[PDB]
Amino acid sequence: MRITFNDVKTSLGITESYDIVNAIRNFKSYVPLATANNVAEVGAGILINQTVQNDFITSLVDRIGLVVIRQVSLNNPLKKFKKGQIPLGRTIEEIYTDITKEKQYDAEEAEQKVFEREMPNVKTLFHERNRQGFYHQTIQDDSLKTAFVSWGNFESFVSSIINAIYNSAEVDEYEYMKLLVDNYYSKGLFTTVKIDEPTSSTGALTEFVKKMRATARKLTLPQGSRDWNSMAVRTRSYMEDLHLIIDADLEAELDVDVLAKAFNMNRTDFLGNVTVIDGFASTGLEAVLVDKDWFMVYDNLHKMETVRNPRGLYWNYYYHVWQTLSVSRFANAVAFVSGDVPAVTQVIVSPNIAAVKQGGQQQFTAYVRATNAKDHKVVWSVEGGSTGTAITGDGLLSVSGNEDNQLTVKATVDIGTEDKPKLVVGEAVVSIRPN
Amino acid sequence: MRITFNDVKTSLGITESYDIVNAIRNFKSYVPLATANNVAEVGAGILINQTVQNDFITSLVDRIGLVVIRQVSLNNPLKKFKKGQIPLGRTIEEIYTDITKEKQYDAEEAEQKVFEREMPNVKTLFHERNRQGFYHQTIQDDSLKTAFVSWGNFESFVSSIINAIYNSAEVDEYEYMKLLVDNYYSKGLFTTVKIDEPTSSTGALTEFVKKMRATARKLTLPQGSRDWNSMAVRTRSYMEDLHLIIDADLEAELDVDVLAKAFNMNRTDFLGNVTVIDGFASTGLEAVLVDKDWFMVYDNLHKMETVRNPRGLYWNYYYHVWQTLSVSRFANAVAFVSGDVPAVTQVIVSPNIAAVKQGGQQQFTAYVRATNAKDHKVVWSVEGGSTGTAITGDGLLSVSGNEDNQLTVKATVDIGTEDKPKLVVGEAVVSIRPN
Amino acid sequence: MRITFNDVKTSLGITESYDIVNAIRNFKSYVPLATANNVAEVGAGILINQTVQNDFITSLVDRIGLVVIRQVSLNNPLKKFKKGQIPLGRTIEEIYTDITKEKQYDAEEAEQKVFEREMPNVKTLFHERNRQGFYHQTIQDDSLKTAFVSWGNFESFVSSIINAIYNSAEVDEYEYMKLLVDNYYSKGLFTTVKIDEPTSSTGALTEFVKKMRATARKLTLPQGSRDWNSMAVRTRSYMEDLHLIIDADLEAELDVDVLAKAFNMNRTDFLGNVTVIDGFASTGLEAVLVDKDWFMVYDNLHKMETVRNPRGLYWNYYYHVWQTLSVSRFANAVAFVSGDVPAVTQVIVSPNIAAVKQGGQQQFTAYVRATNAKDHKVVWSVEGGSTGTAITGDGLLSVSGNEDNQLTVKATVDIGTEDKPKLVVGEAVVSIRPN
Amino acid sequence: MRITFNDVKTSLGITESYDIVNAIRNFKSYVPLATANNVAEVGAGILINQTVQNDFITSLVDRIGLVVIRQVSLNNPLKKFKKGQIPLGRTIEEIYTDITKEKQYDAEEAEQKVFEREMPNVKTLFHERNRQGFYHQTIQDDSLKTAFVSWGNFESFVSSIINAIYNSAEVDEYEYMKLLVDNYYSKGLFTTVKIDEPTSSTGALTEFVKKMRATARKLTLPQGSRDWNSMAVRTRSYMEDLHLIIDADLEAELDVDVLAKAFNMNRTDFLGNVTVIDGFASTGLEAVLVDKDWFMVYDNLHKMETVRNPRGLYWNYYYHVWQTLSVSRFANAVAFVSGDVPAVTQVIVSPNIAAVKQGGQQQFTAYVRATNAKDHKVVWSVEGGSTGTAITGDGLLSVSGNEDNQLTVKATVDIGTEDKPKLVVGEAVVSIRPN
């Protein structure tokens, strides 16, 4: 973010002056291949005519800037969320196998059912968001003529033409991460924890710290929780993989200690697990605690393209960066909001998508993300529409014959009153296959 | 829980792709032997015909999965309780000799008896629990044909087929450990310490911490305590061998510090000596402090076997794990309960099983595990049934001649009242040998 | 401040005595070249007559003292602000590129404009202060005759003639830095934070610590602040690059700890980022927090020259040091004053120098460095003087035709009362070009 | 202090037994040269006759004792104040150059005067104190005959004959240092700080710690203080060179930490900068904080000499140690007293000794060491006795012509009342020369 000649000299396998550009290109028999301190002759050879000048500057900026910026963007602090190129055949589908208890060994039971399968693998689709933008910059011929006086002006020129683009990209990365967090919260997929204005008083601060510690301890249970995630899937995660995104004011109010003591790290390995951003612009969001594998980014491409204006005697080089940013549905992620959030945030049906015959039955179970200790009742509805197809009050749906359309199980929970302008419902998909 | 290709690549002495399966096995002349980046002809040879496809999938799944899971399960956090294959001739009997004070050097006393023995070695029976179960999973032909496009697909396929079984077994291990602890507490062989709701307030928490520290210091006495154990044998242990099993809520309420300062370790060496579970489901059990060698497990076998369904075009592979879990009767084990435990928990007779002649005598001593400071009285009874065979009030039992039955000495402690449906009795089997 | 023979022995690749002076040089055939314990012969050879000893003392003092003092002054505690010789072609102007948000990839809008430039590069002039002075000292013939008795005497003589100049210069550097800081504050380009007498009460101390921590964490925001700097330019800096210049009494009152914990550093790495001076003598300045690249110094030259008085029999050697000190207008710098500062410190117009056609227009914005939480309104004026030239209340100025004079946009804010002998002015120079 | 054979074995370049004495030496053809397990033969050879016995014992005790005690007394904790032998031609005079500002560059002012000198070097005389004494001990013939039974008896004998002398000498070194500090305080060249009985209560302890921290930070000011030291000289010192001599009871009352936190050391490096003595026994002195170079000691000689009593069959060996102790007048030193000390401690005339012609003038400045915050007036007197030689109220003294007597400028400050049996007087010596 303060790139100098040292960074580019470490990125490339070269030392100070280099003749790779004119070696790889006629162009060769214009500038000498001397590596010594003499620079006037090579400057004259470069500026001898417009064609050679343009070819040299284009090759230089394109290749060198692209290589340097690609090498330096992979060492930024938030590089653990950055992967390589997007893998082929991604199919935008996420598959996770659920943990279950073992079956007792019994030859009597084994001698009858031996080809039985186990369970579906709760298939789901990724939550995607792609970005594509450019920065672009201009360079004058005056600050290329005044760049071959010595060997320091050349490195200053390179640093000047790289630093602006690198700083702008590094700034935009954090903003787009913040937008992803905001969109995920707006979709309602976060599991929420209620706090009360941690920055208001000192008691609120220690209450927030205690709640954070308790949430982390419950998340890091070796036996699994199933309470978190956008669906009850019974996953677990390391303590070293948890990442915290916090507001700037809250981070300033909190000390470096105790916050790190709530985890198992000690400052040096804890500041690498926390990201500080200024504001969330979403109700009363304060800090979001996610798993390491929750957020991924794949870089579609990076490119530099140049064009000269012969009327104005200058160049314009555009840097285009395209990449896709995704969040997993099976990862742990806690919202930690402070405001007037409703008591029940989301209801989840475990079977999700299922396929049944024309004369079958299926049991559905529902999980409610209530923010308090009160227990809410759930009513089941079949929706769809047919004769003889119905779901009982316990979530057992039976399908009768002569069934051809598509029906959706709906679980409704009431958090209102006599006048109830608030309904929280969850949807499950059932596909009827004729027998 | 999230084993990747790195773990299997470390477990097996291999790099990237391999051909050991087809080398070890006609089968050899169906697939190419090259290990280059080429995958199309390798996949074509693998899927050319059903027999070769079945042979490859069986060999791969069985051998590779068994080896990898066996190598990765031995590196779990709770690996210090895991022993290898059960040794031959264990005889499920444990022998331990009590420490005794040295006898003064006296030639006059020595010359009378030189072939005399010292004391019996107080044998006891191991407390065991058997486990045998299976998990099993399924794999389809579609997500076998879409695994030879690239080597990354193949390695992801291997990781996916290993991860489910690995995580299920790892989760089940903790639950069986909890069940073993519950069974031991129900048996009542723990030594109990009273605490008062550590999570209720802050005074209870610090009182619990102080009690834990005092108990650990008493346990680690160099001279010996004999107050712990299921039988008074006067053993001892180090502070670095003690292992603490604590409740999830209690662990969350407590801080990482001071708890480690109670012992001599400092966080880094202390988190490896603590196990956290979600509730004991046994009255008011909170945290159990046991010796390192208190809990052992021997793996009888692990075996993976596959079968194919030609009608449905899939495979079912079953992973069976059989092992036995034992707790030693001579290791220290403190319960640390919070509730309404009775005043007297257990009475133990030191001689335990004994053999005496028809006209002999034997002095028995009784240790009563009292949870309060009150001193209880002990009454001795002979049971058995004969004429002249009787035990005094000091615990000295003398057997009269012409005895042929087996008698059981009973030591009883009364903690009742005018109506006393509460009796605590200890048994000592004495065998009369004809003389 | 207590330079001894060890420092010169490390600076020069020599051990104990040397003959480099007579090697460089006739002079050779007066003194022996022996490096052994013999000192009388070389002393007599040096003191044989006036010319030889004068040449020897001139060469020794000038060359050796210059080299040693230059090598040792570069290792002073405040070395990180010290650069080498002034680079050629600095042009006393500073260029910065403002970080801006990216442009969305839109071909339909990109096809219209492809040769456009990006932005002005906010030209500015360096804030400079030159320094040139001398120290000088004297040496007698008696303490040159009584300096060849032993090699220890000779090395003590050398150390004595070097130490005075070294310590005087090392001291004066601190005062020059203090004067530069005071001049910057008097100019008023600092951004100010109000505190209340940290040494008055213990609450004021922790208030000052909290304010310092909050300001540092706002400065080190990854997204960028733009609130600091003498001109709002949206820059960001490391936490490791922040340097603190604090009052002596304030530093004595504050403990070494917690002040370090305010930043991410821990005492050992924090002591190298603080400079302590006794009093600022600038109203109520307490402690100034600046960026690393805010303060720079370039060494014009260092020189030593000797003269001899034949009548008084002594030598005078003068040490001249010339250097320039500059402060950047873009680096972060915070005042932390405790006094009666006005509500508004400075108003900054973003475009600064502008160039517009006779029939053009330009938009301006104004940043007000309010020291309180209140909001103030700003009024725009054209100054200049012509027909048809006017600026709106939103800062948009359109220039009418037939313009020859130079106009200056003025932004004014009022924080006074009915009697208002207090104005804050922000000037932007606009150059009119004909069409 | 607990010297064993290990210390002598590492001091001398030997391993176990040796034949150095008989090799150096007739003597050789009396004792075997075997360093093997044989000890009876060498004992008989040594004790064969009185001449050989005396020669062996004398050579052994003299040479070995001198070498061993010299090599082991230089590794004591108070070795950093211990220098080697007294240098030749020390001249017992201290010369120091006072730091000052830098002259501004001015060719017009420089061209008038180029041969002008700069400053007298405020010379003064060392404060010395000589020490010379002996310890001596006796050894019997019985415990020399009974010392060749085994090779370990010989080394036990050597350790026994060295340990007594070493213990006594190292004990007496502390007493001499305490006496030197007491004499310096009685002379009153310290600068004083008033405290109030730090052991009286607990608030006094923290007040005393705060006073120490403030004084240390004022002493270690990079710019310079001039407030400390026996004369205004404006020097500076490192924090790592400060040494603290504190009373034993006060040290026991204080804790190891926070006292070290007042400086920048952390216990391990701080315990090497503190000296503990059993009471200062000088008014109300508590702890003295001095510079490292304030106190030095030079060892004039160490000698061992033996005599034998043929009438009494024993030996007496005397160990003589002579050394001188010096305290510098230009080093920092703070007294930290708790009593009823006067408001004004000492008045110091900066020019000190002066040499003036018969018609000149001289400017004198007075520095008053006040233990309070008030101000005091200073009066000037000429003493001497002449016509027209007088000093004004600002310290400017003009000498009239035709004068030969040496005069003494006297500065007096009074802190008394109507009855004033107290005057603080500072004297300067001015010598007049005929023009």
PDB file of N, CA, C and O in Angstrom, chain C residues 1 132-136 164 167 170 172 175-176 251-252 254-256 267 277-278 308 314 316 318, chain D residues 97 99 101-105 114-116 118-119 213 217 222-223 234 236 238 261 263-265:
ATOM      1  N   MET C   1      26.560  10.396  23.388  1.00  0.00           N
ATOM      2  CA  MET C   1      27.073  11.681  23.849  1.00  0.00           C
ATOM      3  C   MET C   1      28.423  11.520  24.537  1.00  0.00           C
ATOM      4  O   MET C   1      29.050  12.501  24.935  1.00  0.00           O
ATOM      5  N   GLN C 132      22.401  26.458   8.687  1.00  0.00           N
ATOM      6  CA  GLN C 132      23.837  26.460   8.435  1.00  0.00           C
ATOM      7  C   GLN C 132      24.540  27.149   9.595  1.00  0.00           C
ATOM      8  O   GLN C 132      24.228  28.299   9.919  1.00  0.00           O
ATOM      9  N   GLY C 133      25.469  26.436  10.231  1.00  0.00           N
ATOM     10  CA  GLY C 133      26.184  26.950  11.379  1.00  0.00           C
ATOM     11  C   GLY C 133      27.473  26.190  11.605  1.00  0.00           C
ATOM     12  O   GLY C 133      27.796  25.244  10.885  1.00  0.00           O
ATOM     13  N   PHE C 134      28.215  26.618  12.625  1.00  0.00           N
ATOM     14  CA  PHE C 134      29.490  26.005  12.968  1.00  0.00           C
ATOM     15  C   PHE C 134      29.663  26.007  14.480  1.00  0.00           C
ATOM     16  O   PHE C 134      29.019  26.777  15.198  1.00  0.00           O
ATOM     17  N   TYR C 135      30.543  25.128  14.961  1.00  0.00           N
ATOM     18  CA  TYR C 135      30.788  24.973  16.390  1.00  0.00           C
ATOM     19  C   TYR C 135      32.200  25.388  16.784  1.00  0.00           C
ATOM     20  O   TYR C 135      32.368  26.280  17.620  1.00  0.00           O
ATOM     21  N   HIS C 136      33.216  24.742  16.210  1.00  0.00           N
ATOM     22  CA  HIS C 136      34.634  25.077  16.345  1.00  0.00           C
ATOM     23  C   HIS C 136      35.183  24.904  17.761  1.00  0.00           C
ATOM     24  O   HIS C 136      34.449  25.001  18.749  1.00  0.00           O
ATOM     25  N   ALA C 164      33.512  16.844  21.919  1.00  0.00           N
ATOM     26  CA  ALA C 164      32.866  18.141  22.098  1.00  0.00           C
ATOM     27  C   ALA C 164      31.961  18.473  20.919  1.00  0.00           C
ATOM     28  O   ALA C 164      30.768  18.769  21.090  1.00  0.00           O
ATOM     29  N   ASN C 167      28.868  15.966  20.614  1.00  0.00           N
ATOM     30  CA  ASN C 167      27.771  16.157  21.558  1.00  0.00           C
ATOM     31  C   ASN C 167      27.044  17.471  21.307  1.00  0.00           C
ATOM     32  O   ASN C 167      25.814  17.533  21.423  1.00  0.00           O
ATOM     33  N   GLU C 170      24.770  16.876  18.290  1.00  0.00           N
ATOM     34  CA  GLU C 170      23.687  15.965  18.638  1.00  0.00           C
ATOM     35  C   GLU C 170      22.639  16.661  19.492  1.00  0.00           C
ATOM     36  O   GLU C 170      21.440  16.397  19.353  1.00  0.00           O
ATOM     37  N   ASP C 172      22.029  20.034  19.446  1.00  0.00           N
ATOM     38  CA  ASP C 172      21.355  21.081  18.676  1.00  0.00           C
ATOM     39  C   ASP C 172      20.329  20.518  17.698  1.00  0.00           C
ATOM     40  O   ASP C 172      19.385  21.227  17.313  1.00  0.00           O
ATOM     41  N   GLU C 175      16.843  20.704  19.334  1.00  0.00           N
ATOM     42  CA  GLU C 175      16.261  22.040  19.337  1.00  0.00           C
ATOM     43  C   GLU C 175      15.798  22.449  17.950  1.00  0.00           C
ATOM     44  O   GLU C 175      14.756  23.100  17.816  1.00  0.00           O
ATOM     45  N   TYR C 176      16.545  22.087  16.907  1.00  0.00           N
ATOM     46  CA  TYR C 176      16.089  22.434  15.564  1.00  0.00           C
ATOM     47  C   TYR C 176      14.776  21.731  15.231  1.00  0.00           C
ATOM     48  O   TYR C 176      13.872  22.336  14.637  1.00  0.00           O
ATOM     49  N   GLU C 251       5.457  12.996  29.636  1.00  0.00           N
ATOM     50  CA  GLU C 251       6.075  11.677  29.537  1.00  0.00           C
ATOM     51  C   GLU C 251       6.447  11.141  30.912  1.00  0.00           C
ATOM     52  O   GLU C 251       6.295   9.944  31.182  1.00  0.00           O
ATOM     53  N   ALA C 252       6.946  12.011  31.793  1.00  0.00           N
ATOM     54  CA  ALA C 252       7.289  11.581  33.145  1.00  0.00           C
ATOM     55  C   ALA C 252       6.050  11.138  33.911  1.00  0.00           C
ATOM     56  O   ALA C 252       6.092  10.150  34.652  1.00  0.00           O
ATOM     57  N   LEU C 254       3.138  10.008  32.583  1.00  0.00           N
ATOM     58  CA  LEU C 254       2.623   8.782  31.989  1.00  0.00           C
ATOM     59  C   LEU C 254       3.594   7.630  32.211  1.00  0.00           C
ATOM     60  O   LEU C 254       4.812   7.797  32.120  1.00  0.00           O
ATOM     61  N   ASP C 255       3.049   6.453  32.502  1.00  0.00           N
ATOM     62  CA  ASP C 255       3.883   5.272  32.653  1.00  0.00           C
ATOM     63  C   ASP C 255       4.290   4.721  31.287  1.00  0.00           C
ATOM     64  O   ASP C 255       3.701   5.046  30.253  1.00  0.00           O
ATOM     65  N   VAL C 256       5.326   3.881  31.297  1.00  0.00           N
ATOM     66  CA  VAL C 256       5.840   3.320  30.049  1.00  0.00           C
ATOM     67  C   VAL C 256       4.803   2.408  29.404  1.00  0.00           C
ATOM     68  O   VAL C 256       4.683   2.352  28.174  1.00  0.00           O
ATOM     69  N   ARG C 267       6.081  -1.762  24.332  1.00  0.00           N
ATOM     70  CA  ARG C 267       7.193  -1.234  25.119  1.00  0.00           C
ATOM     71  C   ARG C 267       8.520  -1.243  24.370  1.00  0.00           C
ATOM     72  O   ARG C 267       9.070  -0.181  24.058  1.00  0.00           O
ATOM     73  N   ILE C 277      10.795  16.032  24.617  1.00  0.00           N
ATOM     74  CA  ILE C 277      11.399  17.353  24.710  1.00  0.00           C
ATOM     75  C   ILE C 277      10.803  18.067  25.915  1.00  0.00           C
ATOM     76  O   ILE C 277       9.724  17.723  26.401  1.00  0.00           O
ATOM     77  N   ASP C 278      11.525  19.077  26.396  1.00  0.00           N
ATOM     78  CA  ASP C 278      11.117  19.836  27.577  1.00  0.00           C
ATOM     79  C   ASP C 278      10.449  21.129  27.118  1.00  0.00           C
ATOM     80  O   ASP C 278      11.107  22.136  26.855  1.00  0.00           O
ATOM     81  N   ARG C 308      46.137  27.840  12.148  1.00  0.00           N
ATOM     82  CA  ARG C 308      47.122  27.901  13.220  1.00  0.00           C
ATOM     83  C   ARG C 308      47.495  29.345  13.520  1.00  0.00           C
ATOM     84  O   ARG C 308      47.643  30.160  12.606  1.00  0.00           O
ATOM     85  N   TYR C 314      48.758  27.761  18.869  1.00  0.00           N
ATOM     86  CA  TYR C 314      47.609  26.873  18.987  1.00  0.00           C
ATOM     87  C   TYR C 314      46.932  26.747  17.629  1.00  0.00           C
ATOM     88  O   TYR C 314      47.297  27.418  16.659  1.00  0.00           O
ATOM     89  N   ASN C 316      42.951  26.376  15.723  1.00  0.00           N
ATOM     90  CA  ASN C 316      41.498  26.461  15.767  1.00  0.00           C
ATOM     91  C   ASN C 316      40.926  25.643  14.620  1.00  0.00           C
ATOM     92  O   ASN C 316      41.258  25.888  13.456  1.00  0.00           O
ATOM     93  N   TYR C 318      37.316  24.486  12.850  1.00  0.00           N
ATOM     94  CA  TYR C 318      35.906  24.816  12.716  1.00  0.00           C
ATOM     95  C   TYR C 318      35.191  23.664  12.029  1.00  0.00           C
ATOM     96  O   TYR C 318      35.674  23.146  11.015  1.00  0.00           O
TER      97      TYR C 318
ATOM     98  N   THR D  97      34.474  19.740  28.697  1.00  0.00           N
ATOM     99  CA  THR D  97      34.033  20.794  27.795  1.00  0.00           C
ATOM    100  C   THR D  97      32.521  20.968  27.914  1.00  0.00           C
ATOM    101  O   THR D  97      31.761  20.004  27.774  1.00  0.00           O
ATOM    102  N   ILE D  99      28.843  21.924  26.898  1.00  0.00           N
ATOM    103  CA  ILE D  99      28.083  22.003  25.659  1.00  0.00           C
ATOM    104  C   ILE D  99      27.449  23.382  25.535  1.00  0.00           C
ATOM    105  O   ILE D  99      27.126  24.042  26.533  1.00  0.00           O
ATOM    106  N   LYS D 101      25.462  26.242  22.275  1.00  0.00           N
ATOM    107  CA  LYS D 101      24.728  26.344  21.022  1.00  0.00           C
ATOM    108  C   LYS D 101      25.707  26.414  19.852  1.00  0.00           C
ATOM    109  O   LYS D 101      26.920  26.245  20.005  1.00  0.00           O
ATOM    110  N   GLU D 102      25.179  26.673  18.661  1.00  0.00           N
ATOM    111  CA  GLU D 102      25.964  26.770  17.443  1.00  0.00           C
ATOM    112  C   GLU D 102      25.910  28.192  16.901  1.00  0.00           C
ATOM    113  O   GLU D 102      24.856  28.837  16.924  1.00  0.00           O
ATOM    114  N   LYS D 103      27.056  28.684  16.440  1.00  0.00           N
ATOM    115  CA  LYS D 103      27.126  30.025  15.878  1.00  0.00           C
ATOM    116  C   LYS D 103      26.543  30.047  14.471  1.00  0.00           C
ATOM    117  O   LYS D 103      26.811  29.160  13.657  1.00  0.00           O
ATOM    118  N   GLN D 104      25.756  31.078  14.182  1.00  0.00           N
ATOM    119  CA  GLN D 104      25.166  31.215  12.859  1.00  0.00           C
ATOM    120  C   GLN D 104      26.234  31.562  11.829  1.00  0.00           C
ATOM    121  O   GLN D 104      27.189  32.289  12.117  1.00  0.00           O
ATOM    122  N   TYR D 105      26.068  31.033  10.621  1.00  0.00           N
ATOM    123  CA  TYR D 105      27.017  31.291   9.548  1.00  0.00           C
ATOM    124  C   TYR D 105      26.923  32.745   9.103  1.00  0.00           C
ATOM    125  O   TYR D 105      25.840  33.236   8.770  1.00  0.00           O
ATOM    126  N   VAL D 114      39.162  35.382  13.143  1.00  0.00           N
ATOM    127  CA  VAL D 114      39.321  33.975  12.803  1.00  0.00           C
ATOM    128  C   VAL D 114      40.227  33.231  13.773  1.00  0.00           C
ATOM    129  O   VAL D 114      40.161  31.993  13.830  1.00  0.00           O
ATOM    130  N   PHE D 115      41.066  33.926  14.539  1.00  0.00           N
ATOM    131  CA  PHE D 115      41.964  33.303  15.499  1.00  0.00           C
ATOM    132  C   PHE D 115      41.404  33.292  16.914  1.00  0.00           C
ATOM    133  O   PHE D 115      42.103  32.868  17.838  1.00  0.00           O
ATOM    134  N   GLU D 116      40.169  33.748  17.101  1.00  0.00           N
ATOM    135  CA  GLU D 116      39.574  33.802  18.429  1.00  0.00           C
ATOM    136  C   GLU D 116      39.383  32.401  18.995  1.00  0.00           C
ATOM    137  O   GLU D 116      38.955  31.482  18.290  1.00  0.00           O
ATOM    138  N   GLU D 118      37.602  29.781  21.986  1.00  0.00           N
ATOM    139  CA  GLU D 118      36.196  29.515  22.267  1.00  0.00           C
ATOM    140  C   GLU D 118      35.867  29.562  23.753  1.00  0.00           C
ATOM    141  O   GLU D 118      35.009  30.349  24.164  1.00  0.00           O
ATOM    142  N   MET D 119      36.536  28.761  24.580  1.00  0.00           N
ATOM    143  CA  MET D 119      36.139  28.686  25.981  1.00  0.00           C
ATOM    144  C   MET D 119      37.173  27.967  26.839  1.00  0.00           C
ATOM    145  O   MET D 119      37.793  26.993  26.392  1.00  0.00           O
ATOM    146  N   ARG D 213      11.087   8.164  39.806  1.00  0.00           N
ATOM    147  CA  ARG D 213      10.847   8.088  38.368  1.00  0.00           C
ATOM    148  C   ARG D 213      10.993   9.455  37.712  1.00  0.00           C
ATOM    149  O   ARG D 213      11.631   9.584  36.656  1.00  0.00           O
ATOM    150  N   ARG D 217      13.855  10.464  34.906  1.00  0.00           N
ATOM    151  CA  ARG D 217      13.504  10.953  33.578  1.00  0.00           C
ATOM    152  C   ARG D 217      14.046  12.357  33.336  1.00  0.00           C
ATOM    153  O   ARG D 217      14.373  12.704  32.196  1.00  0.00           O
ATOM    154  N   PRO D 222      17.453  14.053  26.826  1.00  0.00           N
ATOM    155  CA  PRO D 222      18.432  14.142  25.729  1.00  0.00           C
ATOM    156  C   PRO D 222      19.024  15.528  25.546  1.00  0.00           C
ATOM    157  O   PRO D 222      20.189  15.645  25.146  1.00  0.00           O
ATOM    158  N   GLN D 223      18.257  16.584  25.816  1.00  0.00           N
ATOM    159  CA  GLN D 223      18.746  17.937  25.577  1.00  0.00           C
ATOM    160  C   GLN D 223      19.731  18.398  26.643  1.00  0.00           C
ATOM    161  O   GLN D 223      20.673  19.134  26.330  1.00  0.00           O
ATOM    162  N   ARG D 234      25.808  21.202  32.593  1.00  0.00           N
ATOM    163  CA  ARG D 234      24.877  20.874  31.510  1.00  0.00           C
ATOM    164  C   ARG D 234      25.334  19.630  30.741  1.00  0.00           C
ATOM    165  O   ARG D 234      25.723  19.680  29.574  1.00  0.00           O
ATOM    166  N   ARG D 236      24.480  15.201  30.123  1.00  0.00           N
ATOM    167  CA  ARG D 236      23.396  14.237  30.000  1.00  0.00           C
ATOM    168  C   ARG D 236      23.957  12.832  30.165  1.00  0.00           C
ATOM    169  O   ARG D 236      25.150  12.591  29.966  1.00  0.00           O
ATOM    170  N   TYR D 238      22.776   8.349  29.991  1.00  0.00           N
ATOM    171  CA  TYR D 238      21.824   7.325  29.588  1.00  0.00           C
ATOM    172  C   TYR D 238      21.002   6.849  30.782  1.00  0.00           C
ATOM    173  O   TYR D 238      21.369   7.037  31.944  1.00  0.00           O
ATOM    174  N   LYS D 261      10.188  -0.709  36.710  1.00  0.00           N
ATOM    175  CA  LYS D 261       9.355  -0.072  35.697  1.00  0.00           C
ATOM    176  C   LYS D 261       9.528   1.442  35.681  1.00  0.00           C
ATOM    177  O   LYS D 261       9.244   2.077  34.659  1.00  0.00           O
ATOM    178  N   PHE D 263      12.367   2.832  35.665  1.00  0.00           N
ATOM    179  CA  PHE D 263      13.340   2.866  34.586  1.00  0.00           C
ATOM    180  C   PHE D 263      12.798   2.046  33.417  1.00  0.00           C
ATOM    181  O   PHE D 263      11.626   1.661  33.393  1.00  0.00           O
ATOM    182  N   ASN D 264      13.641   1.765  32.430  1.00  0.00           N
ATOM    183  CA  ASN D 264      13.239   0.947  31.296  1.00  0.00           C
ATOM    184  C   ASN D 264      13.664  -0.510  31.430  1.00  0.00           C
ATOM    185  O   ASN D 264      13.384  -1.306  30.529  1.00  0.00           O
ATOM    186  N   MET D 265      14.325  -0.879  32.524  1.00  0.00           N
ATOM    187  CA  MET D 265      14.756  -2.252  32.722  1.00  0.00           C
ATOM    188  C   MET D 265      13.606  -3.107  33.251  1.00  0.00           C
ATOM    189  O   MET D 265      12.592  -2.603  33.741  1.00  0.00           O
TER     190      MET D 265
END
